[PDB]
Amino acid sequence: PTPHVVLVPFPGQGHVAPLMQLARLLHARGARVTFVYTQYNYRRLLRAKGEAAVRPPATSSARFRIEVIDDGLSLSVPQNDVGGLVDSLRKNCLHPFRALLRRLGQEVEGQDAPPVTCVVGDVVMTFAAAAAREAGIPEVQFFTASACGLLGYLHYGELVERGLVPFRDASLLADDDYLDTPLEWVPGMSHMRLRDMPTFCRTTDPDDVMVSATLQQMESAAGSKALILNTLYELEKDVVDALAAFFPPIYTVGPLAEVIASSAMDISIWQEDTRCLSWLDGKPAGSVVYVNFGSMAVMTAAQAREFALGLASCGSPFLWVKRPDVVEGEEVLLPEALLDEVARGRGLVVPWCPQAAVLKHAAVGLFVSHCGWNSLLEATAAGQPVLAWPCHGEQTTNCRQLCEVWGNGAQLPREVESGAVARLVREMMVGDLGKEKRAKAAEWKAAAEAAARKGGASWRNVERVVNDLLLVGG
Ligand SMILES: O=c1ccn([C@@H]2O[C@H](COP(=O)(O)OP(=O)(O)O)[C@@H](O)[C@H]2O)c(=O)[nH]1
């Protein structure tokens, strides 16, 4: 009997990517896969890339099905409106997904399809677990960010109990001294501060969507058959050991993409710029500052101007991925100093890039990052030190660990100012600060390679979760 796994990501590229990595692996191991897109995600992909690029090839098509479910969302909802996305999905997708499961069951007799044997839901997509449980189908959840981020979200309830959420004083939401307050009660992260908690706690609304949804997600995941985390156990040991008491068995599989690599579908609305890698070929080893802020976050025009002036004054060539909609508001031209550097060939601004390959390019010496988890996994595998500017969600938690525990990064202030940007980049490129972080980055690169090669800790967890849970139906 062919196992049949249904996978359900949240509609953001950092959630689709790890679940698609897993789906491709399961297909390689002989499973039937059904990959479930929301209509929001699917229609936005089709209008950007066309159906042919988004759907599977005819070679894999027999055992790789794409299905689309209703979500009630306008395609105009932007990726930075996380609460709007989360609220519609949790309210609107359950009954469409229940109907999809029924249809897949009818296809067993109708077309000799394999019965569904497991659902793998993104922790965010709690309806997937609810529907699987109703139907008597095992379900295993996949949290797509860091273990430290999960630990933060797990303690949102305790923030509420201690009166810290919602914020009773709106003036404290951005009070840097208040946000520095230590929270000494988080197991596995004794150095947690209020600002290090994932940022959605910073709300005065007692009915805030993201706090409510996080509580639902934690309760859902606690009831799953198992939990997949795309992280390196060695990197996050203290946090994972603290998480163990609150969840089903945890499998640390990170970096999953590297486990697969050791041993045909476009998931992005953006086109990766092919000129990046050849431009880097023309630059000396370790010389280039690479800047990228992921697929969801936005910044202000003033922040963008200060980053641009900081890059022009930092002393290094740079590759800046400036996503086309990253800046709130009307288009503002880049400063003359940066444009002249681009014209001289010393800098390059592109809309989107092949990120894993860019980070592994010998010319890159530093990653200025928003601290999105997939980006940090890509930097960790590449051995690139990180200068952090966390934006939302668990990016703050990641930044705290980068700085204080993992040791492969340093942080910029939230309020971007060109002079301080240039100075911190310079310290990271030629200073003792950068030497320390780059050396630690090299250690984590070796650790990630050991974990991902055959016999390593992440490799073993991939084999166990795949063979003992995901492919075992039949
Ligand atoms: O120029 C870029 C920047 C990002 N990414 C991909 O977009 C995702 C970003 O996910 P992450 O978790 O880092 O952050 P998020 O986008 O969720 O904030 C990852 O798969 C990256 O490899 C990409 O393909 N090209």
Residue numbers in the entry: 9 to 271, 280 to 490
Copied sentences from the primary study:
Here, we report substrate‐bound crystal structures and rational engineering of substrate and stereo‐specificities of UGT85B1 from Sorghum bicolor involved in biosynthesis of the cyanogenic glucoside dhurrin. Finally, (S)‐p‐hydroxymandelonitrile is stabilized by glucosylation catalyzed by SbUGT85B1, resulting in the formation of dhurrin (Jones et al., 1999). UGTs are a superfamily of enzymes that use UDP‐activated sugar donors to transfer a sugar moiety to an acceptor molecule. The structures reveal the characteristic UDP‐glycosyltransferase GT‐B fold found in all known plant UGTs (Lairson et al., 2008) with two Rossman domains forming a narrow catalytic cleft, where the N‐terminal domain predominantly interacts with p‐hydroxymandelonitrile, while the C‐terminal domain predominantly interacts with UDP.
The UDP binding site is characterized by the presence of the highly conserved family‐defining Plant Secondary Product Glycosyltransferase (PSPG) motif (Osmani et al., 2009), and consists of residues W368, C369, Q371, H386, N390, S391, E394, and Q411, as well as residues Q21, E288, N308, S311, and V337. Coordination of S391 with the pyrophosphate group confirms a previous hypothesis of S391 to stabilize binding of UDP‐glucose (Thorsøe et al., 2005). In contrast, R201, also previously hypothesized to stabilize binding of UDP‐glucose (Thorsøe et al., 2005), is not in the active site, and is located 22 Å from UDP. The binding mode of UDP in the sugar donor active site is identical in the two structures, and thus not affected by the presence of p‐hydroxymandelonitrile in the sugar acceptor binding site. The two structures are highly similar (root mean square deviation [RMSD] = 0.17 Å over all 6148 atoms), thus not indicating significant structural changes upon binding of p‐hydroxymandelonitrile. Crystals were developed by the sitting drop method and the structure was solved via molecular replacement using MtUGT85H2 (Li et al., 2007). Finally, the high resolution of the UDP–sugar binding site may enable engineering of sugar donor preference for the production of new‐to‐nature compounds with tailored properties.
